[PDB]
Amino acid sequence: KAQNPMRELRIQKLVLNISVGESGDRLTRAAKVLEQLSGQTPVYSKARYTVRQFGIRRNEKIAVHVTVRGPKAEEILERGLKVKEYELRRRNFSETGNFGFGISEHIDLGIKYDPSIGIYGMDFYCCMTRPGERVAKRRRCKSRIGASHRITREETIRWFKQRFDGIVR
Amino acid sequence: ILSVKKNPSNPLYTQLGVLTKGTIIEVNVSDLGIVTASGKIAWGRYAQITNNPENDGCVNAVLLV
Amino acid sequence: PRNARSKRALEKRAPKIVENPKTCLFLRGTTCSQITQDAMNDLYAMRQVHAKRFHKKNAIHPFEDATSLCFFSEKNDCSLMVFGSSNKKRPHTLTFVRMFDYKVLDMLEFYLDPDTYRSISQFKTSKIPIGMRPMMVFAGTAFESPVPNAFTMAKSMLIDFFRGEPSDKIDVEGLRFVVVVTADEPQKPILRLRVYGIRTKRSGTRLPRVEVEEHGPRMDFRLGRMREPDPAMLKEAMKKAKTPQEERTKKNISMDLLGDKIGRIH
Amino acid sequence: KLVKNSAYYSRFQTKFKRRRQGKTDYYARKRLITQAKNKYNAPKYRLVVRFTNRDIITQMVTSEINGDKIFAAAYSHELRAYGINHGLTNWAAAYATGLLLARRVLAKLGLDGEYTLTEAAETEDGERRPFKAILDVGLARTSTGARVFGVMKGASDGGIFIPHSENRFPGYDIETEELDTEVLKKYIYGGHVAEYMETLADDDEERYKSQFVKYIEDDVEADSLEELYAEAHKQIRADPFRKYVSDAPKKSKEEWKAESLKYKKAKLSREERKARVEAKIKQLLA
Amino acid sequence: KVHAVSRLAHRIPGHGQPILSCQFSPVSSSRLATGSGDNTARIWDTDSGTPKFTLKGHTGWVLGVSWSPDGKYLATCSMDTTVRVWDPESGKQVNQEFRGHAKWVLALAWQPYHLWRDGTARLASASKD
Amino acid sequence: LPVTVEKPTPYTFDLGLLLANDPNPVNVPKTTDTQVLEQHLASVARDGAQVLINQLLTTTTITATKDGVLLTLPPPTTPLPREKPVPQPKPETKWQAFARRRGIKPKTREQRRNLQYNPTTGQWERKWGYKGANKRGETDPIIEVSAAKEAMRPEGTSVRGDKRREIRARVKKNQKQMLRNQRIAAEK
RNA sequence: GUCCUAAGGGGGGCUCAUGGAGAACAGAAAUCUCCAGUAGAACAAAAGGGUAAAAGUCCCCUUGAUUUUGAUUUUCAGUGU
RNA sequence: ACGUACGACCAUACCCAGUGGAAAGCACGGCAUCCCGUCCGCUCUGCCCUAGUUAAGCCACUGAGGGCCCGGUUAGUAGUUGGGUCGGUGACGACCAGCGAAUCCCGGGUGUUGUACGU
């Protein structure tokens, strides 16, 4: 039953995250990088609690993120894997079948240097799904995905190796 | 005239019912034929006195609509 | 009450001249039979809109101590209570408790006959709509006791249970169901509870011909232990407040058909 | 530590079964059936509107103590009797299904020996009162242009008094607080679908063929949709109880009982369960 | 037996000026004609509460709309001293506007259907002249 | 079939509760057959429902409205206990007793409105609450301050909080009086 | 010592504390993703059964800061509309 | 009997996993012009019902471990009120009564059901 076309793995979404930790011009520039990379307006995240060690206070914007779906997520993930040379570690893949990584400079993705913005690193996180994910997301008759329809770490590692021709160490 | 609602200079003037300029009075509007949205007949409304009755010998008012 | 919602709840629970419809709390003891639970479910189904249900077991014996019953009445703002229990001595018992000022006004036990009990689901008829109050018929000679006894107490309690909401008007289409309580004076008399749906037929006259069809439940009771009120508490409970819309009659003063105040001289 | 332990399982309180299934909003249901402006002890009716992938379900429902009662039902698959064979979930089909339900309710009441207390106590100055019902949308979102209000508009035009405003009909303008009856007429007669057919046939012919393959196969052009829906409205108002038979296999009820019992798997008895337990014990010993 | 109307069936906008005349079709209540001070008449479908046709061509207030007794024509009379006849099932004007009134045309009356002769209908128009 | 029930004793009614009292005995048969027992009980129910419907249809005023055909019901007459005692007047507070002794009349609703006309600004403003006149100057650009008052002022404090200080003092005194009145009323 | 188109009301959407597994800086503690989570959070009160498509929390609309009428209830009225 | 829509009891229905599911129905699904809403057509909303697919939801059956629900037993027993009624100066010890548990143990079970339209 594993050859059923409704069990075919695909990317659900790709989330790009920048946690600058400071509000103001740096956060605005990071939002500018996210907007220029994605094509859509980003999201400002507020701090849950006050930490004096990190120099942040509650209800203060310290981070920015973008959710991207469709072939745009595939092409942005392709750029990220081009930056990472299609090499991932085994610890990157989660037990629920998702994965992710991080880059230190967004210039290597193909973004021209603008001195008024600077250099920002980014977090890529890709979620994987099978068709039938609507069952746990729709408003009416929201239910749980059955156990055999869930995605495992070995399955997403195999899918990554088959799709992007990368290697996992 | 149904009642004197508010003489602007003094609440005592309102209590005495003085009709001067700017005074808010309640008037009987049965002749105007005003029907509310629910079909009831509105027969009491507010008007403002626009003249000086002590100088004119009459009361002139404008309905507040 | 700092919160406006808590202030609204407190004002709802405040004593009023025109009282709210009474709320009935349905609860069971540590040992309660399935027959008693089915009986409680039928009574709750007849009184859904003004009822609250507990679902745990409560170690309460009402005729020994009713402090927990008073606590539940105060917490839930329930003034009527149906309490289920079972025993070797009393196999199927429904204890009706009526409260006044969050204190026990009176109590009465009903012993249910298990072999003649039929639930609402055992009759294949159309049922009473949710929220609809039935009419009441009390039949027999057991309710005309010159001295207050268990049967007059049961009549008062069942009227309070099936009372519903008071209204000055009623639609003629809201007269389709009747609760009939039958009991005769006398070894113990049996108080019988029946519910009937009502059909109307043409009779050749202005008044229609009534027919009845059984709705359920089919209930047989023997009246047991009874806790009567303190007379001062009963006097305070049967005091009647007067609405401001009921004018105080003045001598030689009346209101005519135009609303003018009219005085009489002699 | 294990969160799901014996104490957690014992302390767990389940929701209502239909809340667990995600089908019923009991918060809204309580206010829909147990709340009334007047206390005249009168029965109340609700128009239940539900949507599936392939069908529209409309019901006229009263609420009794042991379960709800259905006074009348209309389904959008019944529009094939009146000539609508495509787009059975769209806004035009929603309007037609609401109209069908309204006409069926009126024909059942005779508003198109046992007698009621209303006729027994009717006075001299008494006029016919309209059938009244309130809308029950369920879990659907009540935004402007939703098909639930299309069903509602069809029923109200069919003659059920349903209390409503107009700020959720297609064509309503929120800043000017006005309704465009031209857009409303277009949506009633399916002109949004027809305009989509013309737009797709001009822009993307392949997507047009894939999306409207059944329209083209049955030769239903875009410009005939208004006439088709108008003739359907006329036929619905003429014969609200026209019988429609489907292409599904037809057997009797007893034949369907036998057919389903041929595929039902029987529950194991105590003897078989004890035999399996003894076999498992023997296998564990061996 | 006709039962008393008790509630709003539909409120249909579309006219830019006050409605000055209204009349149902003689065939049924499904078709209604109104004539307004925006120099137009309008045909309405009353089953769905929707506009059906907008008859344009007058240059004054449409003081009167009148159906032919068989229901196949709609006559409008206006302050522009003219009378027009329209086909209600297509919304098109029939032939040309009727010219010859010196002042406003206030009222119309069709000849009764059983009196029509010479293969035509007759229409009477009353004017301020 | 007849629509009248004849019995040795007449029925009594409480149409406010839709209640019919049958004082006649229910001669339940001394048999073991459930069918005949429930048949006799259903006959009693039939008679009671018939006389109740007859009384409702003949002794009440009938009105045909858009809601339906309605019967006017009399107020209920069967005595039933209340759930809570009848509300009583609250014990008099110290202010209420003082005003009763001194003949101090309650202010009118127009007199106690939270609105006044400021001449200098030519605007209408609240006397208290958010942006009330009792806090006037707390957000003004410039405040003249007395040199003696600034010298007597504690270190760190500002003149911009003086009106809030006076407001907090007045509120504290008022709540102390209110709590004293509550305690005395609870003792009574 | 600082700040606010006030609180309140209605409707709609959403689900919390925490744990596990993952994500450059980021490391017990920043943000993001999934899974599990009967409320163990928040808000009210002082449950021996408060509240989960909410009474929690965010959006939209009102924010008009104490409406009008009364032959009726209670108290008062030498200024009794 | 099975499916769907509204339900009633609201775990015998819940938590975890495996196997099977004719017909139809549900469902996953496909497409974003129009109505409408999002950081993202994820959700919501609109259009298609063709095509793929029972993989999941859903249904049935089975399986552990918990949980939950009935019936008996405990037991008319502990305990609590009564000089209650007999002795005991009395307190109290029996007896007589009235109320009246729970633990342990044993046995059984793991959803019934209303209306309407269909297969």
mmCIF file of all heavy atoms in Angstrom, chain E residues 31-54:
data_model
loop_
_atom_site.group_PDB
_atom_site.id
_atom_site.type_symbol
_atom_site.label_atom_id
_atom_site.label_comp_id
_atom_site.label_asym_id
_atom_site.label_seq_id
_atom_site.Cartn_x
_atom_site.Cartn_y
_atom_site.Cartn_z
ATOM 1 N N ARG E 31 -44.202 40.308 -12.900
ATOM 2 C CA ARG E 31 -43.657 41.460 -13.603
ATOM 3 C C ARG E 31 -44.290 42.741 -13.089
ATOM 4 O O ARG E 31 -45.519 42.849 -13.010
ATOM 5 C CB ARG E 31 -43.869 41.332 -15.109
ATOM 6 C CG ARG E 31 -43.083 40.203 -15.721
ATOM 7 C CD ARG E 31 -41.595 40.435 -15.559
ATOM 8 N NE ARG E 31 -40.818 39.317 -16.073
ATOM 9 C CZ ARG E 31 -40.439 38.274 -15.351
ATOM 10 N NH1 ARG E 31 -40.738 38.177 -14.067
ATOM 11 N NH2 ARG E 31 -39.738 37.305 -15.929
ATOM 12 N N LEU E 32 -43.449 43.712 -12.750
ATOM 13 C CA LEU E 32 -43.918 45.002 -12.268
ATOM 14 C C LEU E 32 -43.250 46.105 -13.071
ATOM 15 O O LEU E 32 -42.081 45.996 -13.434
ATOM 16 C CB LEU E 32 -43.622 45.162 -10.775
ATOM 17 C CG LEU E 32 -43.836 46.512 -10.099
ATOM 18 C CD1 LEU E 32 -45.314 46.804 -9.956
ATOM 19 C CD2 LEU E 32 -43.143 46.521 -8.761
ATOM 20 N N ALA E 33 -43.993 47.169 -13.362
ATOM 21 C CA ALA E 33 -43.457 48.311 -14.085
ATOM 22 C C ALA E 33 -43.534 49.552 -13.214
ATOM 23 O O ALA E 33 -44.562 49.817 -12.588
ATOM 24 C CB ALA E 33 -44.208 48.546 -15.394
ATOM 25 N N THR E 34 -42.438 50.305 -13.167
ATOM 26 C CA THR E 34 -42.407 51.585 -12.476
ATOM 27 C C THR E 34 -41.895 52.659 -13.420
ATOM 28 O O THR E 34 -41.105 52.390 -14.321
ATOM 29 C CB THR E 34 -41.525 51.557 -11.210
ATOM 30 O OG1 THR E 34 -40.212 51.094 -11.540
ATOM 31 C CG2 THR E 34 -42.127 50.654 -10.156
ATOM 32 N N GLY E 35 -42.363 53.871 -13.211
ATOM 33 C CA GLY E 35 -41.909 55.013 -13.987
ATOM 34 C C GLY E 35 -41.485 56.125 -13.058
ATOM 35 O O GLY E 35 -42.175 56.427 -12.081
ATOM 36 N N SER E 36 -40.337 56.736 -13.368
ATOM 37 C CA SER E 36 -39.692 57.612 -12.402
ATOM 38 C C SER E 36 -39.378 58.973 -12.999
ATOM 39 O O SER E 36 -39.514 59.207 -14.200
ATOM 40 C CB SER E 36 -38.401 56.989 -11.876
ATOM 41 O OG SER E 36 -37.793 57.786 -10.883
ATOM 42 N N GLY E 37 -38.906 59.860 -12.132
ATOM 43 C CA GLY E 37 -38.398 61.166 -12.476
ATOM 44 C C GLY E 37 -36.976 61.200 -12.977
ATOM 45 O O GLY E 37 -36.453 62.285 -13.233
ATOM 46 N N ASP E 38 -36.314 60.052 -13.111
ATOM 47 C CA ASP E 38 -35.022 59.995 -13.780
ATOM 48 C C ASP E 38 -35.160 59.744 -15.276
ATOM 49 O O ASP E 38 -34.216 59.247 -15.896
ATOM 50 C CB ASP E 38 -34.114 58.930 -13.141
ATOM 51 C CG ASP E 38 -34.690 57.520 -13.198
ATOM 52 O OD1 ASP E 38 -35.786 57.302 -13.749
ATOM 53 O OD2 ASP E 38 -34.026 56.606 -12.677
ATOM 54 N N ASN E 39 -36.333 60.043 -15.840
ATOM 55 C CA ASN E 39 -36.676 59.924 -17.256
ATOM 56 C C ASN E 39 -36.673 58.488 -17.761
ATOM 57 O O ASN E 39 -36.588 58.260 -18.967
ATOM 58 C CB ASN E 39 -35.761 60.793 -18.133
ATOM 59 C CG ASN E 39 -35.678 62.219 -17.647
ATOM 60 O OD1 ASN E 39 -36.300 62.585 -16.653
ATOM 61 N ND2 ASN E 39 -34.878 63.027 -18.322
ATOM 62 N N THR E 40 -36.796 57.503 -16.877
ATOM 63 C CA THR E 40 -36.811 56.110 -17.299
ATOM 64 C C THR E 40 -38.007 55.390 -16.697
ATOM 65 O O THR E 40 -38.563 55.790 -15.664
ATOM 66 C CB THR E 40 -35.529 55.346 -16.905
ATOM 67 O OG1 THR E 40 -35.476 55.178 -15.486
ATOM 68 C CG2 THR E 40 -34.267 56.057 -17.383
ATOM 69 N N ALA E 41 -38.385 54.304 -17.364
ATOM 70 C CA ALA E 41 -39.236 53.289 -16.772
ATOM 71 C C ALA E 41 -38.397 52.045 -16.524
ATOM 72 O O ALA E 41 -37.361 51.849 -17.154
ATOM 73 C CB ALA E 41 -40.430 52.949 -17.662
ATOM 74 N N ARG E 42 -38.832 51.212 -15.593
ATOM 75 C CA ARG E 42 -38.124 49.985 -15.280
ATOM 76 C C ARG E 42 -39.107 48.840 -15.112
ATOM 77 O O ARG E 42 -40.191 49.000 -14.542
ATOM 78 C CB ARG E 42 -37.261 50.133 -14.018
ATOM 79 C CG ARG E 42 -35.935 50.841 -14.258
ATOM 80 C CD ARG E 42 -35.224 51.139 -12.960
ATOM 81 N NE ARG E 42 -33.870 51.637 -13.158
ATOM 82 C CZ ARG E 42 -32.787 50.874 -13.194
ATOM 83 N NH1 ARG E 42 -32.863 49.561 -13.075
ATOM 84 N NH2 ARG E 42 -31.598 51.445 -13.350
ATOM 85 N N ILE E 43 -38.713 47.684 -15.633
ATOM 86 C CA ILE E 43 -39.407 46.421 -15.431
ATOM 87 C C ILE E 43 -38.646 45.646 -14.368
ATOM 88 O O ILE E 43 -37.413 45.560 -14.420
ATOM 89 C CB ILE E 43 -39.507 45.614 -16.738
ATOM 90 C CG1 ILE E 43 -40.209 46.429 -17.823
ATOM 91 C CG2 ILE E 43 -40.260 44.317 -16.514
ATOM 92 C CD1 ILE E 43 -41.617 46.805 -17.481
ATOM 93 N N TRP E 44 -39.381 45.093 -13.406
ATOM 94 C CA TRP E 44 -38.826 44.345 -12.291
ATOM 95 C C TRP E 44 -39.395 42.937 -12.279
ATOM 96 O O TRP E 44 -40.602 42.748 -12.490
ATOM 97 C CB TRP E 44 -39.142 45.018 -10.956
ATOM 98 C CG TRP E 44 -38.889 46.477 -10.923
ATOM 99 C CD1 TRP E 44 -39.777 47.468 -11.202
ATOM 100 C CD2 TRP E 44 -37.664 47.122 -10.573
ATOM 101 N NE1 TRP E 44 -39.183 48.688 -11.053
ATOM 102 C CE2 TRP E 44 -37.881 48.504 -10.672
ATOM 103 C CE3 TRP E 44 -36.402 46.662 -10.194
ATOM 104 C CZ2 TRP E 44 -36.890 49.433 -10.395
ATOM 105 C CZ3 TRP E 44 -35.418 47.585 -9.925
ATOM 106 C CH2 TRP E 44 -35.666 48.955 -10.029
ATOM 107 N N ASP E 45 -38.524 41.960 -12.029
ATOM 108 C CA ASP E 45 -38.934 40.602 -11.706
ATOM 109 C C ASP E 45 -39.133 40.509 -10.200
ATOM 110 O O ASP E 45 -38.180 40.670 -9.429
ATOM 111 C CB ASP E 45 -37.883 39.602 -12.182
ATOM 112 C CG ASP E 45 -38.205 38.174 -11.789
ATOM 113 O OD1 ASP E 45 -39.393 37.831 -11.632
ATOM 114 O OD2 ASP E 45 -37.254 37.383 -11.634
ATOM 115 N N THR E 46 -40.370 40.254 -9.783
ATOM 116 C CA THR E 46 -40.722 40.310 -8.373
ATOM 117 C C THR E 46 -40.532 38.986 -7.646
ATOM 118 O O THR E 46 -40.578 38.969 -6.413
ATOM 119 C CB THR E 46 -42.174 40.772 -8.211
ATOM 120 O OG1 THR E 46 -43.060 39.731 -8.633
ATOM 121 C CG2 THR E 46 -42.439 42.013 -9.040
ATOM 122 N N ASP E 47 -40.331 37.883 -8.369
ATOM 123 C CA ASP E 47 -40.064 36.610 -7.702
ATOM 124 C C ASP E 47 -38.713 36.625 -7.003
ATOM 125 O O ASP E 47 -38.604 36.220 -5.841
ATOM 126 C CB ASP E 47 -40.137 35.462 -8.706
ATOM 127 C CG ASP E 47 -41.485 35.365 -9.383
ATOM 128 O OD1 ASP E 47 -42.473 35.869 -8.811
ATOM 129 O OD2 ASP E 47 -41.562 34.780 -10.481
ATOM 130 N N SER E 48 -37.676 37.104 -7.685
ATOM 131 C CA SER E 48 -36.353 37.222 -7.099
ATOM 132 C C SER E 48 -36.027 38.627 -6.623
ATOM 133 O O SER E 48 -34.945 38.836 -6.067
ATOM 134 C CB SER E 48 -35.285 36.771 -8.106
ATOM 135 O OG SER E 48 -35.313 37.562 -9.279
ATOM 136 N N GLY E 49 -36.922 39.588 -6.825
ATOM 137 C CA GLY E 49 -36.663 40.966 -6.449
ATOM 138 C C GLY E 49 -35.537 41.617 -7.220
ATOM 139 O O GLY E 49 -34.727 42.339 -6.630
ATOM 140 N N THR E 50 -35.475 41.395 -8.523
ATOM 141 C CA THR E 50 -34.348 41.821 -9.333
ATOM 142 C C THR E 50 -34.802 42.747 -10.454
ATOM 143 O O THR E 50 -35.959 42.694 -10.887
ATOM 144 C CB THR E 50 -33.620 40.605 -9.926
ATOM 145 O OG1 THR E 50 -34.566 39.739 -10.563
ATOM 146 C CG2 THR E 50 -32.890 39.839 -8.838
ATOM 147 N N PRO E 51 -33.932 43.643 -10.915
ATOM 148 C CA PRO E 51 -34.247 44.414 -12.121
ATOM 149 C C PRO E 51 -34.254 43.524 -13.350
ATOM 150 O O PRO E 51 -33.462 42.590 -13.474
ATOM 151 C CB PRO E 51 -33.116 45.446 -12.192
ATOM 152 C CG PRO E 51 -32.024 44.872 -11.375
ATOM 153 C CD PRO E 51 -32.685 44.102 -10.284
ATOM 154 N N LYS E 52 -35.162 43.826 -14.270
ATOM 155 C CA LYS E 52 -35.334 43.065 -15.493
ATOM 156 C C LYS E 52 -35.037 43.901 -16.724
ATOM 157 O O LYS E 52 -34.236 43.484 -17.563
ATOM 158 C CB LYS E 52 -36.763 42.502 -15.550
ATOM 159 C CG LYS E 52 -37.070 41.674 -16.770
ATOM 160 C CD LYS E 52 -36.492 40.289 -16.643
ATOM 161 C CE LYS E 52 -36.913 39.413 -17.800
ATOM 162 N NZ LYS E 52 -36.329 38.052 -17.693
ATOM 163 N N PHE E 53 -35.642 45.084 -16.849
ATOM 164 C CA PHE E 53 -35.356 45.949 -17.991
ATOM 165 C C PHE E 53 -35.356 47.404 -17.557
ATOM 166 O O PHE E 53 -36.002 47.772 -16.578
ATOM 167 C CB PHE E 53 -36.369 45.765 -19.130
ATOM 168 C CG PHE E 53 -36.256 44.450 -19.833
ATOM 169 C CD1 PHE E 53 -37.304 43.550 -19.811
ATOM 170 C CD2 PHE E 53 -35.102 44.111 -20.515
ATOM 171 C CE1 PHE E 53 -37.202 42.336 -20.450
ATOM 172 C CE2 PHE E 53 -34.992 42.899 -21.153
ATOM 173 C CZ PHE E 53 -36.045 42.011 -21.121
ATOM 174 N N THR E 54 -34.633 48.233 -18.306
ATOM 175 C CA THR E 54 -34.611 49.672 -18.083
ATOM 176 C C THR E 54 -34.925 50.373 -19.397
ATOM 177 O O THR E 54 -34.069 50.452 -20.282
ATOM 178 C CB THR E 54 -33.259 50.127 -17.533
ATOM 179 O OG1 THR E 54 -32.967 49.408 -16.331
ATOM 180 C CG2 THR E 54 -33.286 51.602 -17.214
#
